[PDB]
């Protein structure tokens, strides 16, 4: 019902948890992928300034 579409890009060499020195290669997942999630939280940040 007039849903919002979000463009997504996929990587295979990832650097999670600030890890400078170790990079992981995700092997190719064979087939078509589909997962349905519950977004339950957000992490926001103000811009501040002289307003």
């Amino acid at each position, epitope marked *: 019902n007039d849903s919002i579409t979000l463009p997504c890009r996929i990587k295979q060499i990832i650097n999670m948890w600030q890890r*400078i020195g170790q990079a992981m290669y995700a092997p190719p997942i064979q087939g078509v992928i589909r997962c349905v999630s519950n977004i339950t939280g957000l992490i926001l940040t103000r811009d501040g300034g002289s307003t």
Partner: antibody
Amino acid sequence: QVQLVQSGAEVKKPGASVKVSCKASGYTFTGYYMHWVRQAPGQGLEWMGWINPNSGGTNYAQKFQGRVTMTRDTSISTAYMELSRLRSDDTAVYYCARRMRSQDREWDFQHWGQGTLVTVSS
Amino acid sequence: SALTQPASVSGSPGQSITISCTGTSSDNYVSWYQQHPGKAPKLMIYEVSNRPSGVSNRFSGSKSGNTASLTISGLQAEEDADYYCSSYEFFGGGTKVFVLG
């Protein structure tokens, strides 16, 4: 022995761009945010925005939202401040500040750079 | 510029001086900076009263309500500079401290 070294004086045209360097030394560069404060000649301090060297996430002030782009280089431990479309009032000494080692929070700029002077020509 | 600082405060060599920083609203933690002309600012007082290392004990801070104050006892000839009070991201207009006769 926290050392903050900025770039040399810059002279740019109105509407052009200028990128200010800020090389850090004496601590872990990827553990503390990096702020940017400018000061017009004869005026007071003005906070522009902080950048987190970890992920690169910045926080530009609402006054410069859409003009300043803050990046960093973890390999050489140097943060950058680029201001696009320079106006006549942008002539100022641009400092890069860092929070205190203590108190586990920001907003206590103990370490400052020598400053970079930008001019408006005109 | 939500923090109001006096444009000029005078003092004589030896006596004490006081810089008041009145900020609108603001209900905790305040900071003070000293900037000599041609140099970068220097953190003198953080969190109202605490003092970093190694600024002289002659500098002390206080706050009551919407008014924070910086007290400098025993003024010298090198003490005169620009003084700014800080709250979160905001800065004051600045206070020029004079130590002339």
